[PDB]
Design a protein around this ligand. Structure first.
Ligand SMILES: Nc1nc2c(ncn2[C@@H]2O[C@H](COP(=O)(O)OP(=O)(O)O)[C@@H](OP(=O)(O)OP(=O)(O)O)[C@H]2O)c(=O)[nH]1
Length: 403
RNA sequence: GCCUGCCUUAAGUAAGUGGUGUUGACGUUUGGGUCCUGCGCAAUGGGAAUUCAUGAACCAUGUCAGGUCCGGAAGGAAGCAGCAUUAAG
């Protein structure tokens, strides 16, 4: 949904020049790449990653006109898209599933990254998308309000939150937590671990002790996307002093650059598994490097009863499959239209639910005063009613043309 | 010119056949209608005033899905299928 908006803005005007011109020249690719290189540098992408990326794209883009003279510029875009995709990890990296339940997932990171919130988001995702039965664990004893924060999120999910207070070691908390999860048949155990503002020795000593007693199948670093290269460095230090298997990037809804997301793989070899997209518990999505690459480049992929079904499936029934979300991402690339219904759509739905069942079955049976009364009940005098009838006639004509 | 025809014109006179009344307004006239035609009517039939179940988008029906507005809040609010829902079938 969210992220990278600033890099896109920059790239997409240089992309404009090449896409329109089918012809590929030595000077054209050089020029596009100079702009691409400046945009990646200003987005705080790792410096070595930039210089390697500009090299591999430019090499492929001048054998590509030799590759193909058909749709040549649209070929240059496909190379950039393919390299952006590899740069953010090849393909979706799915959650591990232990051979024997429970799967123990360790959440680590620095204070303020979003550990505690993301723990709750991941539990939520495991139950809704995968039909799992998770358990949250309170292993950060070093701040007050930390436990109560997790417990509060747990009460909104109806999921247990294991805690022994703040006078007991996190090694013991993790141990008992995992054994209760075995006895009571919980699929997943999510450990919310400690952390101050900066790494120290007595953070890593504790985290290695917890890994030891817990033998986790996944160790996720939760890291703030808006910190750019500082996030890449936090990743490097965690991956070296214990083992990371994954990364959760938080606060993409405030990250217009994307430096961290374009750099984590190449510097640490750790894959990005999820993105946080907001404060609520349901703002977590799997990281899909194709679709972000496509995003960055502006590249995509009974009349009354039918109206009621369209209103149900369009207003609150959003959620397509078979790459429907991928081709419809960003309003299907905007579609050259800057107007959304919103309250206009709400008024259209209110005008739609202004007629009887017979009027819904036969829309042409309404007399002039017959839907003058309906317009008085709806709020638009004749304008909304006649626009709705014109739209229904246009939809009928389109259905007759399609059939 | 009835010598034959005035038989159709002022009674009949009589053999043949089923009956029948006139002094009696009699009675052995047994069995049928005894107003057929207009006035005020009552067996009897045809459609009834009124009885029990169901029924108006606006358009008469109390809040009688909701959305807009007045309002940080609430109520008025297609009272749309359901409710009393009538006379209208
Ligand atoms: N917009 C957005 N926010 C996220 C996201 N993930 C986490 N946060 C926010 O970051 C802040 C830290 O979250 P925690 O859950 O406490 O992280 P921690 O355990 O690592 O300390 C929280 O709010 P906070 O403490 O109130 O933030 P602030 O007031 O310090 O700025 C949280 O709402 C995300 O994906 N999008």
């Amino acid at each position: 949904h969210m992220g990278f908006e600033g890099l896109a803005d920059r790239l997409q005007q240089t992309i404009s020049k090449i896409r329109g011109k089918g012809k590929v020249s030595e000077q054209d690719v050089k020029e596009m790449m100079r702009e691409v290189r400046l945009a990646l540098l200003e987005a705080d992408v790792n410096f070595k990653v930039v210089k390697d990326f500009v090299k591999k794209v430019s090499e492929r883009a001048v054998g590509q006109d030799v590759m193909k003279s058909l749709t040549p510029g649209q070929q240059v875009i496909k190379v950039v898209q393919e390299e952006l995709t590899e740069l953010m990890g090849g393909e979706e990296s799915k959650i591990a599933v232990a051979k024997r339940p429970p799967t123990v997932i360790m959440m680590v990171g620095l204070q303020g990254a979003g550990k505690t919130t993301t723990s709750g988001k991941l539990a939520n995702l495991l139950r809704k998308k995968h039909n799992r039965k998770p358990m949250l664990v309170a292993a950060d004893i070093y701040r007050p309000a930390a436990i109560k924060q997790l417990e509060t999120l747990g009460k909104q999910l109806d999921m247990p939150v294991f805690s022994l207070g703040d006078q007991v070691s996190p090694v013991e908390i993790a141990k008992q937590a995992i054994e209760k999860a075995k006895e009571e048949h919980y699929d997943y155990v999510i450990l919310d671990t400690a952390g101050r503002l900066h790494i120290d020795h007595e953070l890593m000593d504790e985290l290695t002790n917890v890994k030891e007693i817990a033998n986790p199948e996944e160790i996720f670093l939760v890291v703030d996307s808006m910190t750019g290269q500082d996030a890449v460095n936090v990743a490097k230090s965690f991956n070296e002093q214990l083992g990371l298997t994954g990364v959760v990037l938080t606060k993409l809804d405030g990250d217009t650059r994307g430096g961290a997301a374009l750099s984590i793989r190449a510097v640490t070899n750790t894959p990005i598994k999820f993105a946080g997209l907001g404060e609520k518990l349901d703002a977590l999505e799997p990281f899909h490097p194709e679709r972000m690459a496509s995003r960055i480049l502006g590249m995509g992929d009974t009349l009354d009863d039918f109206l009621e079904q369209l209103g149900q499936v369009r207003n609150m029934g959003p959620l397509d499959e078979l790459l429907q979300m991928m081709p419809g991402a960003g309003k299907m690339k905007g579609l050259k239209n800057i107007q959304v219904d919103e309250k206009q759509l709400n008024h259209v739905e209110a005008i739609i639910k202004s007629m009887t069942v017979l009027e819904k079955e036969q829309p042409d049976i309404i007399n002039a005063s017959r839907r003058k009364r309906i317009a008085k009940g709806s709020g638009t005098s004749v304008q909304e009613v006649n626009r709705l009838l014109k739209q229904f006639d246009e939809m009928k004509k389109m259905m007759k043309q399609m059939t």
